[PDB]
Structure 1
Amino acid sequence: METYVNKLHEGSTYTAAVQYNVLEKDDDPASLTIWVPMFQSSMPADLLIKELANVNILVKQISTPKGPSLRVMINSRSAVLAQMPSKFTICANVSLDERSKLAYDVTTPCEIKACSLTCLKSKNMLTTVKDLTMKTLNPTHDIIALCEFENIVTSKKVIIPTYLRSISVRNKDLNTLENITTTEFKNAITNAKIIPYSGLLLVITVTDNKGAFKYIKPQSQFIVDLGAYLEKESIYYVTTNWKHTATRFAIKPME
């Protein structure tokens, strides 16, 4: 099994962000990716990944008010994985590969092809997009991150534009935008990481609270979902073959 460890946060207690790529144990197997609800651990990541790799996964496709969902079961957990959610539900459209299909309401064993563990800061130092929608007043502009990938098989470039937040900008600040797209903000976008979680997850390190980072807790990790953009993709194919090559941004007047 292929394993991946990315120590974005290098403190002893951290938030584990775990994603498995799996394959139905059957002829004509469905292929799908499962991300586990975040949980805190204190076992060093290079040891925790060995435990994560040894679990057994079963899935069941079900119908919910939101549409098709996958019920996930994780067992064969070792003692440290008491820490880890073992029953939970994820979106089937994101999780399942293009052309991959599961019968409904049948508990289905899956073989693990790969396991990725990303270490993030503690939950109180994580900021979401939803968190920030409650932090603006009559905004004037949208901030979008432009996530650039190269498909290493085809050489094709791919841009995924992901919404970050809306803000209000003073007219005088528009001349250079320097009070909004501060040096801190620009460097944080340039150096942002995209890792295998929620399909893909953009992680921006918020180094202070000025301008485009206003009302964010300093030294937070601002995490952003890309999986909604991967519904029609195979997530395992994407995390194997889409090389993250750059992150840019756009500040757009709102519509």
Structure 2
Amino acid sequence: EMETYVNKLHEGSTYTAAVQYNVLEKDDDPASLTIWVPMFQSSMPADLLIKELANVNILVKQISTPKGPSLRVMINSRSAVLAQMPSKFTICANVSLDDSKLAYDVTTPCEIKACSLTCLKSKNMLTTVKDLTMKTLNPTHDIIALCEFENIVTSKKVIIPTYLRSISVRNKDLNTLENITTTEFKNAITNAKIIPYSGLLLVITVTDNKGAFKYIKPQSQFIVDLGAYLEKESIYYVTTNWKHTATRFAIKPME
């Protein structure tokens, strides 16, 4: 007994596995934290891989690094397929930890409460925000995705504005924006998905390379971190209680 989540955003037999675990220190007065695994390719059917992922054992250790507090993660496993998966890696503690409550330099076992597997396109079909940085040397506008959630327990609405890219826009194009916010673009934002990875991960399907999507490989998935906006939240609480209700955008003059 453990909740499991499988999101197949790609139909390929081969896919990029984006795996996030919500865990609880094995202890009285336990720390609660969320771990995401560095992305890895697999060809095992998703509904089968999730059974293997669910059966691993996880240990963490809080350490100090030039970046601040980090979490060393170790994953134990008897499943042959998970030779494919990183078993030692480090993640930022501020996003990972809810809380207190974890000691430094003590390897700590954690009980798995939930495991989420999202299937994305192959790594050569994934575009990041960093990928698009420096593509425009003199941009005039920033493009922001406004990710709207409902907290299902409180009924409160939450909007997380996340940076996508900066572009240059011709004066002529400002009057309707139809050459920037193309039909392709607007549809891609409206139908964008938010999945449990890196805290939360926005995934935009890039159907064209015109306007707002210039210099992106067509049919790539453009992936965007929201974890940096969730440092003060419990990720498990978020992935359980924040329902993604819409995605809007703003094209803001740089100022």
How far residue 137 of structure 1 moved from its aligned partner, in angstroms, is 2.3
Kindly tell me: are residues 77 and 93 of structure 1, through their superposed partners in 2, closer, same or farther at Cα, counting changes over 3 Å?
farther
Deviation at 1:77, TM superposition (A): 4.1
Structure 2 distance, partners of 1:13, 1:144, is 31
User: For the structure 1 residues 162 and 77, does the alpha-carbon distance in structure 2 shift closer, same or farther, using more than 3 Å as the test?
Assistant: farther
Q: Secondary structure at the match of 1:185?
A: helix
Corresponding position of 1:63:
64
With 149-158 and 70-79 compared, the bigger mean Cα shift is at 70-79
Matches within 5 A, 1:90-109: 90-98=91-99, 101-109=101-109
Cα drift, residue 101 of structure 1: 1.9
SS at match of 1:49: helix
Q: In 2 relative to 1, CA 92–77 (structure 1 residues): closer, same or farther, beyond 3 Å?
A: farther
Question: Residue 195 of structure 1: CA displacement?
Answer: 0.1
SS state at 1:130 partner? helix
In 1, the alpha carbon distance for the partners of 2:70 and 2:235 equals 16
Q: State how far apart, in whole Å, the 2-side matches of 1:12 and 1:142 are.
A: 36
Shift of 1:134: 2.3
- Number of equivalenced pairs: 254
CA-to-aligned-CA distance 1:38-61 (integer Å, 9 cap, x gap):
000000000000000000000000
Instruction: State the alpha-carbon separation in 1 of the partners of residues 137 and 185 from structure 2.
Output: 20
Measured in 2, the distance between the counterparts of 1:76 and 1:45 equals 18
Q: In 1, Cα distance between the equivalents of 2:148 and 2:43?
A: 33
4+ runs of 1 displaced by more than 2 Å? none
Distance in 2, matches of 1:142 and 1:183, equals: 19
Q: How high is the sequence identity, in percent, across the aligned residues?
A: 100
Q: TM-score, normalised on structure 1?
A: 0.99
* Secondary structure at 1:139 match in 2: coil
Q: Distance in 2 between matches of 1:122 and 1:134?
A: 24
1:221 aligns to what? Answer: 221
Offset at 1:158? Answer: 0.2
Unaligned runs of 5+ in 1: none
Give CA deviations for 1:159-182 in whole Å, capped at 9, x if unaligned. 000000000000000000000000
Task: Find the residue that maps to 1:18 and give its secondary structure.
Answer: strand
| Distance apart, 1:76 and its partner CA | 1.8
Q: Report Cα offsets for 1:71-108 as digits up to 9, x if no partner.
A: 0000124000000000000000000004x521000000
Computed over aligned residues only, the root mean square deviation of the Cα atoms, in angstroms, reads: 0.6
* In structure 2, C-alpha distance between the alignment counterparts of 1:69 and 1:77, rounded to whole Å: 27
Cα distance between partner residues in 2 of 1:240 and 1:77 = 29
Alpha-carbon offset, residue 235 of structure 1: 0.1
Instruction: Output one character per residue of 1:204-247: Cα deviation in whole Å (capped at 9) or x when no partner.
Output: 00001000000000000000000000000000000000000000
